[model samples]
Target chain A: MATPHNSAKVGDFAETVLMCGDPLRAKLIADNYLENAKQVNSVRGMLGFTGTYKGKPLSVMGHGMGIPSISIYAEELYNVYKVKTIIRVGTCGTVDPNVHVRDVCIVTASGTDSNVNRMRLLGHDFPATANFEVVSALVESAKALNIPTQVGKAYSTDIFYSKEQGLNEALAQYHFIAVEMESAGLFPIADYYGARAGCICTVSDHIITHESATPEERQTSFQNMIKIALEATLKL
Target chain B: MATPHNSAKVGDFAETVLMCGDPLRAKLIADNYLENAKQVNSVRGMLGFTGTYKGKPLSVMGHGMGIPSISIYAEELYNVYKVKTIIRVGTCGTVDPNVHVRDVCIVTASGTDSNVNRMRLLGHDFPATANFEVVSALVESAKALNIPTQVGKAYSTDIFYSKEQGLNEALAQYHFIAVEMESAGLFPIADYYGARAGCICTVSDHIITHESATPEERQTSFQNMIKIALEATLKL
Candidate 1:
């Protein structure tokens, strides 16, 4: 059928999907990694594609920014297209000094300043954790490839240009490796819909030390992250 | 001179403000209760007025639905307009059986599914409590007027049409009196800027028992809430 945001019919998506925040990255994956990839949906310029990876049916889609944006797509994919898993392949700005630029971070759990996850649970604190099988698959894939990876909690935020002072310092106390958007929303929505989900982000910048990747570096820097996500999707 | 949302100049707003969720409610307060009222801003149809209540200069403004929407207006009012106190007079759906339709709720604190507050404070659980003086003033006014009132924590949610199962039952376990969308965002933003803030909501419906106010009853129903908030603002 059709959703307000998505135009894909049934069978347009695969059982497992790889999502990223940027539509261009989705296109990049479809171009470089997928075999026989074809565009499935492009509403609001949120590009989605379905193809085969290693002879296994797979899909790649862009989730856009923030919890609200990603939640809509995740909900629709899981409920409408009967997709079973979503692995978010994205980038983050590191809050911890131990996490540096170009390293991969496997998101085990997310602690958010966004309300979307808590809305699904009661007013209580919700543990926005990745599915155990999904998290393990990512870790194994990273280890097999010998790529440097950190597995821990991350912070999901609603605002990109946040005005809140001392936020980086505060998140450091909780030991969140990096900061991004979408994982917190994805984990909860997947759980609610009986689907598996996880996230792995490449460190694009350091928030505390003010270190950052150049625009050119950012556009092409996530090969290791993408490899791990693709491997995990196949394994799952 | 003007924020992106509000078109008013720096001195157009009063130091103390009465806020509601609806633009029409702001207009109604100005029409019925304020003396020498003037429309200061109506950007995005979010009505704002400056006038006097009981010969004391004050302002009334509408903060739209959700945390991001209210946070934007609250930030502007505090930072640009130099407003010092804001008392939110809005309606909420009750989660507690004892909290019935048409009753007043003095929001002492709020638990939210939104991350706007956590983004301000260092990712820790921010006690999104109302200003003590503001809370006391409202309670005292309610007591002096002998109006039926309940004081407790409320839940501020991002989604209005929530599909979460067992959410109401779980929130009742936490003793949240009612559910609304703006107070959690308001209290923290006020705290961040050193401004005083509080919320007092009229029960519009009950989530547990399925009791609800008719459209006519909801519109004309909050006279007592307005009176108490005005008295409390004067006291604050």
Candidate 2:
């Protein structure tokens, strides 16, 4: 069947879908990482593809920016598609001083400023955390691949260019290792649907230190992030 | 000066502005309530007007639907245009059984499912509430006009067509009389700028009771809402 935004038919997508925010990244992962990869969806310019990663079937797509946009695609994927697991392979800003640019962070839980989860759970805070199985599998995948990763909490913010810069520093002080936009919207929807979700992100920059990475450094981090995310699907 | 959304000059607006969610209501209040009313802003179809009400200078504008849209206008009015007090005249769904359709309620404080206020205050719950002076004047105006009203807490929500409807009943149990969309956004921004903001909304529908109003009842409710809001502007 088809939803308003997605044109993919049933069974077109694999049970595990790896999502990033950029549509180009979806194409890039399909082109580079998967064997016999085929495009499954191109609607809304949010490309999706199904392929084999090391001979294991896998799917990947892009969920757009912010909770509002991400929540729409998440709802469709979780409910309509009846897909099992959604692991978000993305990048984030490091808010903690202990973390540096290009480090991979496996988000154990996310603290978000979005109200999407609270709406689902009676106007109270909904942990919006990753499933234990998914997170454990991701951790094991990283260990097996010999990739050093930091596992901690993240703050998913709605406003990127917030009116006040102090808010960023405030978030940094709250001890969220990573700060990104979409995962806060994803994890709760997964919980609501009884499906599992996890996020693996490379530190693109440092919010507190104002750090950056070279192009090659950035590419290597992204490569490491996707490989860990894809390898974890085998464990699930 | 002009913002991306507003086209009005700084001086085109009065210090006291009455805001609602509907652009049409901006024109309606201007056409009927104010004398010598002049349309000041029509950008993005969010109409804004300035005129005199009972020989008192007043401005009326529409701030669209949610916190994201309303907060932009709030930022401009408070910071850019240097407008002092913004009184939102709007409608809400009452979760409290004591509240019925057409009953007027003054929002003293708001608990929101939005992250806007949280981001401003170290990711903790920001008590998004009206300043005592603003609420006092609103109460005084209602008292002066002999218009019966209720003063209580509200829950400002981000999503309207929420995935689950039970969240509405959950908010009812939380003791919030009014459930609206914008104030959770407005109150905090006003607090940030050290400006004052208040919300006066009529109960257009009851969530628990599932009660509604006729056109006449709605018009009367709107009239009562605007009158209470506009009269309070004179008090300030």
Candidate 3:
């Protein structure tokens, strides 16, 4: 089916997909990891590729940024593509001082500022949470790799300029480990469509301490998170 | 100064602005009310006009859809354009069965599913409320005009789908009179910028009882809300 954004045909994508916010990041994964990867789409400059990892089918795509923009992609993937799994691998600002750059986080639940599910659910307190199976896989992968990881609520916010003063501090009070742009958007959509979704992020920066990894460091993040994503997808 | 979206010069906008999500609605206001109106912008088709209303300088603009997108315009108006007060005149779906279609609503307070303000003031439970002064003006204007209005809380949501489930029923339990898209976004931005902003709305539909307004009923709309917004600016 032709959509306003995607041009990929039905069945062109696998049921399981890994999404990043940046098109370039999707390209990076395809170039480095996928074997026999084939270009599926580039609509709105949001790249999508289908390939095999260890001979298992998988697709990687960019979801862009923000709730509205990403909602369109997520809906299309779940409804039109009939995709059942979407895992977001991205970067976030650490709210907790204990979190350092290059540290990976597996989101057990996301506390978002966005209203994707809130709106979808008609105003109930619908929590943005990860799929239990996905969480299990991610935890297992992290343990096997012996990578230091934390699983907790990630504050997913819709507004960058908050109305409430010291909001970051308040979220930290509730123990939100880090802040990110896209996880809040991803978590709700995943929950609504009955698709398995999770976020495995690297601490690209620290909000409290003002520490950060360079753009180069972000591009070449320790493969531990990516490895976790891949092995977990294979149920390793 | 060039902001992210608007091309209008810093001083191009007046201190008072009437905003709606649709550019066409902004244009309609400019055409119907403004004297010697001048078009200020059409950036991304977000139409903006500046003109005199009863010989008083005022501006009208479209904020587009969703909190994030609209927040950008609201921030620019207050931060760069020097616009001090913003009033959103729009339509919404009511969860309150008592609120029939086409009923004008003066929002005393709003509850949001958007995490914009929730993250900032978690423990305090800062309700997404109307500026008390602006609310007073709206109520007074409606009273003076003999306009029938329901003053109450509204659920301002980010997602439009899935809200159809028990979500609205639950919000109805919370006594939210209606649901709309822009109020939550507008409220928090105004709060953040230390500027005055409020929303006046007419019920476009009723989710609780499946009532809807025809196009004509939505248009006539008591005019008290508009009067309230207009008088609110001068008095505030």
Highest lDDT, which number?
1
What docking grade does candidate 2 earn? incorrect
Error of model 1, residue B210, in angstroms: 0.4
lDDT of 1 by residue, A1-236 (tens): 37856789989999999998666678889999999899998765568999999999999998765676577788889988999999999889988868888778999999877756656566789899899999999999989988878999989876655877788888988789979877888888888888899999988889888888776666545878888888888788
Candidate DockQ scores, in order: 0.08, 0.09, 0.14
In candidate 1 the C-alpha lDDT for residue B180 amounts to 88
Question: What residue runs in model 3 are displaced by over 4 Å at the alpha carbon?
Answer: A1-65, A68-156, A162-236, B163-166, B222-228, B231-234
Model 1 lDDT per residue over B1-236, tens place: 38856789999999999998666778889999999999998665678999998878999998755566577788889989999999999889888867789889999999887767666666789978999999999999999988878999989876655787888999988889979877888898788789899999999889889888887777655888999988887787
Q: Per-residue alpha-carbon lDDT of model 2 for B1-236, expressed as tens digits?
A: 37756789888899989998767778889998999999998664577999999898999998765676677788889987888899998888898868889999999999877778767887887899898889999999999999999899998776654666477778877768898878888888888789999998998888877898777999998888788888898889
Candidate 2 lDDT, A1-236, residue by residue in tens = 38856789878888888988766788889999989899988765667999999888898887755565567677788887888999988889987878899999999999876767766777787898999999999999999999999999988776654666576777767778888877887888898889999999999889778888778999999988888998899888
Computed on alpha carbons, the lDDT of every model, listed in order, comes to 0.84, 0.83, 0.77
Best by TM-score: 3
Q: Once model 1 is optimally superposed onto the true structure by TM-score, how far is the C-alpha of residue A14 displaced, in angstroms? A: 29
User: Could you tell me which 10 consecutive residues in candidate 3 chain B have the lowest summed lDDT?
Assistant: B156-165
lDDT of 3 by residue, A160-216 (tens): 554556777887778787687667677667766777888888888787778878767
**CAPRI rating of model 3:** incorrect
User: Chain B TM per candidate, please?
Assistant: 0.96, 0.97, 0.93
* Candidate 1 TM-score to native: 0.57
